[PDB]
Amino acid sequence: MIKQRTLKNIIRATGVGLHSGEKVYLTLKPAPVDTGIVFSRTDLDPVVEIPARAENVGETTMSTTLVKGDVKVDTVEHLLSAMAGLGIDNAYVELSASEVPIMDGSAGPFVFLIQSAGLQEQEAAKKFIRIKREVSVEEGDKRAVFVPFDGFKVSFEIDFDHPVFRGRTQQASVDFSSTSFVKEVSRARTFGFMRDIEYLRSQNLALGGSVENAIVVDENRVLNEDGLRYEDEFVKHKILDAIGDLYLLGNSLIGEFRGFKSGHALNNQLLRTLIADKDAWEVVTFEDARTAPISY
Ligand SMILES: CC(C)(N)[C@H](NC(=O)c1ccc(C#CC#Cc2ccc(N)cc2)cc1)C(=O)NO
Ligand SMILES: [Zn+2]
Ligand SMILES: [Zn+2]
């Protein structure tokens, strides 16, 4: 059978919060079967735990935030994307502050942490959510969709008209039958436009931002000295974001996500909308891995 997975060992890293600019200690720890991913604010007294579930998401305008009462964990999506991509079902995530460190702006550093810790198979069937009916949400011209698909696929389109994006592909369709999350998605960095970053900084936000952890673009150019890591890095980062935001479902997906100019807010709305309609999905397990449309 396809088994649940956790970490073999505890592993640590340090970094700064993109939004807060605050140095933070990050710890990833093994967890028992059926735990899911649970964040813990170990700086607080008492320590506060927040399960990484769609219903615990708070504000989403900037990054995906988990909340419990007055306690938050900001910017969970890049770490969760790595968890999702490597098939980690169960883990504790300990933080010394209210924001996951931004690291290099991608999921690469978290893939390295997970691969370094090692993967541990557990004696329980891994549960998948299979999309049975297409479900969609929209806001203005933005749209996010789950579509039935025998496998796991993420498609995305962005539609920037600024000169810097002219001629760029702005679309990608990743079928993970034949695409490596690690090699072809995980290192795509977050990005921002100068005018937007200036606005944030003017308000004493984005205090951890630097050209070392974000792609900076203006109307016409990519400003980073060495340009892009992937030819289509922008849309690949939107896919990275979607994979992490989607993992708040708490299980891997059998289906296709399609995003059109969408972000964290529609991603979470899509999850809550899916969860609420039991005719649109079912939980499946695979007693024979060979019969599965996916592979970890
Ligand atoms: C792409 C998204 C989905 N919109 C989203 N990214 C952000 O919202 C975002 C917000 C701020 C920054 C930034 C910076 C910077 C700087 C800087 C300031 C001063 C100096 N002297 C040098 C550099 C990057 C990304 C995201 O990935 N969510 O997961
Ligand atoms: Zn423009
Ligand atoms: Zn992102």
Numbering used by the authors: 1 to 296
Sentences from the paper on this structure:
In this study, we used solution NMR to investigate the conformational states of small-molecule inhibitors bound to LpxC, an essential metalloamidase that catalyses the deacetylation of UDP-(3-O-acyl)-N-acetylglucosamine during the biosynthesis of lipid A in Gram-negative bacteria. We chose Aquifex aeolicus LpxC (AaLpxC) in the lipid A biosynthetic pathway for structural and dynamics investigation due to its exceptional thermostability, which has enabled both NMR measurements and crystallographic studies (for example, refs 13, 14, 15, 16). We show that these enzyme-bound inhibitors dynamically access alternative, minor conformations in solution in addition to the ligand state observed in the crystal structure.
Taken together, these solution measurement-derived rotamers collectively portray an inhibitor envelope that can accommodate three substitutions at the Cβ position of the threonyl head group. Structural analysis of LPC-040 in complex with PaLpxC indeed revealed the anticipated ligand conformation with the two Cβ-substituted methyl groups forming hydrophobic interactions with F180 (F191PaLpxC) and the stem of K227 (K238PaLpxC) and the amino group directed towards solvent accessible space to form a water-mediated hydrogen bond with the backbone carbonyl of F180 (F191PaLpxC). Excitingly, the Cβ-triply substituted compounds LPC-037 and LPC-040 both showed enhanced LpxC inhibition, displaying Ki* values of 14±1 pM and 12±1 pM, respectively.
